[PDB]
């Protein structure tokens, strides 16, 4: 079959390569069984705002990504750099969970390269962002019919926020050339305004 003929002449002919097949599937992962509280940032009480996003360093963990799907419908599970699945076979050194609450139409801006209002003044992701963004609607846990104004966000800032930077300052903005020197009035708009969730 390697010569494509039903009759072979006299001589030596190379046909294939004797490659020994594997036997076992040794893993040899580190010695870690402490299932750290990965549910403390997913199923907890009220969530952080965008200008004060909570950044929890998670190390010495057993990252079981098969526990965030049996919960409420998690949408837009977009991993940049890795696949959504096949995350249960990789050993990371230390991960960071940045938790906050945004609007429905503002979920697109949480992505490398995308710009807007939340991705430029509240939380910016770098172009080499090797992580996963996970969003889910909370209209039953973060909304009530009374007028919901317990979530703040920044609208005005001098320059664009650099990737992985938390801006919790309260310096007044100046939309014009008038030296407001801290009065919060005409052309001195407050930099942090509240949301409206009905």
């Amino acid at each position, epitope marked *: 079959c390697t010569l494509k003929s039903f009759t072979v002449e006299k001589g030596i002919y190379q046909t294939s390569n004797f490659r020994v097949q594997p036997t076992e599937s040794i893993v040899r992962f580190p010695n870690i069984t402490n299932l750290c509280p990965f549910d403390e940032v997913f199923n907890a*009480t009220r969530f952080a705002s965008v200008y004060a996003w*909570n950044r929890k360093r998670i190390s010495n963990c057993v990252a079981d990504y098969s526990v965030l799907y049996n919960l409420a419908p998690f949408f837009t599970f977009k991993c940049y750099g890795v696949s959504p699945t096949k995350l249960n076979d990789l050993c990371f050194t230390n991960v960071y969970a940045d938790s906050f609450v945004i609007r429905g139409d503002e979920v697109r801006q949480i992505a490398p390269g995308q710009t807007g209002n939340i991705a430029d003044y509240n939380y910016k992701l770098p172009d080499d962002f090797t992580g996963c963004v996970i969003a889910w609607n909370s209209n039953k*846990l973060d909304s*009530k019919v009374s007028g919901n104004y317990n979530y703040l966000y920044r609208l005005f800032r001098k320059s664009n926020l650099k990737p992985f930077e938390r801006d919790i300052s309260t310096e007044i903005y100046q939309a014009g050339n008038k030296p407001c020197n801290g009065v919060a009035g005409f052309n001195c708009y407050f930099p*942090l305004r509240s949301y409206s969730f009905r």
Partner: nanobody, 117 residues
């Protein structure tokens, strides 16, 4: 070692002015945020006002021109002077320190019960 003690709890009638404040422990609680919140039974809390370290005070857009919180004592305490009482002001008022990032690093102090007849 945080044992915030509130005051102002009692029984009032519509038309007065509530001057409630929670005392902060002797420490450098500043350089971090500080706010107030109520715990009306039935659903999640409702944030009323903040006391940002810069001095700029932001108030809930719903409760505008009715509640005022200042810092002109600067010793160990805040102030909560709110007027125009109604029947729905009977809630459990708390003073949260690390708000807007809570549930992981916030310290809910004591709790007082107010009621407006």
């Amino acid at each position: 070692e945080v044992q915030l003690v509130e005051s102002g709890g009692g029984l009032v009638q519509p038309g007065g002015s509530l001057r409630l404040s929670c005392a902060a422990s002797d420490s450098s609680f500043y350089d971090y945020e500080m706010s107030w919140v109520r715990q009306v039974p039935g659903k999640t809390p409702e944030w009323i006002g903040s006391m940002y370290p810069s001095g700029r005070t932001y108030i809930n857009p719903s409760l505008k021109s009715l509640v005022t919180i200042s810092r002109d004592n600067s010793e160990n305490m805040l102030y909560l002077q709110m007027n125009s009482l109604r029947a729905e002001d009977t809630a459990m008022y708390y003073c949260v320190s690390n708000w807007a990032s809570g549930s992981t690093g916030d310290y809910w102090g004591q709790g007082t019960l107010v009621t407006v007849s």
